[PDB]
Design a protein around this ligand. Structure first.
Ligand SMILES: [Br-]
Ligand SMILES: [Br-]
Ligand SMILES: [Br-]
Ligand SMILES: [Br-]
Ligand SMILES: [Br-]
Ligand SMILES: [Br-]
Ligand SMILES: [Br-]
Lengths: 66, 65
């Protein structure tokens, strides 16, 4: 995506940013905690640009492991 | 049960399981990719116990070492 691409994620991973670190940068950590418990909070979080970016980064880091 | 608890999460963190490692263990990464352009698919994915466990672990790792 325009705001978080391939090359930007490579820079984040070189910096040692974990998925959880990036969620904190996004100010999403507490919302994620609420989403694990509440279907309403989950559905709301799932519609966000911030969660889209977070999940993008998560798959990127997994593909660069092992 | 399949749902997480804090002792399970402590064990995972001691073993060095990262959040993305846990997504891979749950076989969620393909599903995450697939749901990125569908509201419905994302909603369905968020309704799964697997996704809820992943998000619980993400917050756990954020608050623990
Ligand atoms: Br983006
Ligand atoms: Br960003
Ligand atoms: Br939200
Ligand atoms: Br944003
Ligand atoms: Br780590
Ligand atoms: Br699903
Ligand atoms: Br859970």
């Amino acid at each position: 995506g325009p705001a978080l691409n391939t090359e930007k994620m490579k820079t984040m991973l070189k910096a040692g940013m974990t998925v959880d670190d990036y969620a904190a940068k996004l100010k999403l950590t507490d919302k994620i905690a609420a989403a694990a418990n509440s279907a309403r909070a989950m559905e709301k979080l799932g519609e966000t640009l911030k969660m889209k970016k977070l999940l993008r980064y998560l798959n990127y880091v997994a593909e660069h492991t092992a």
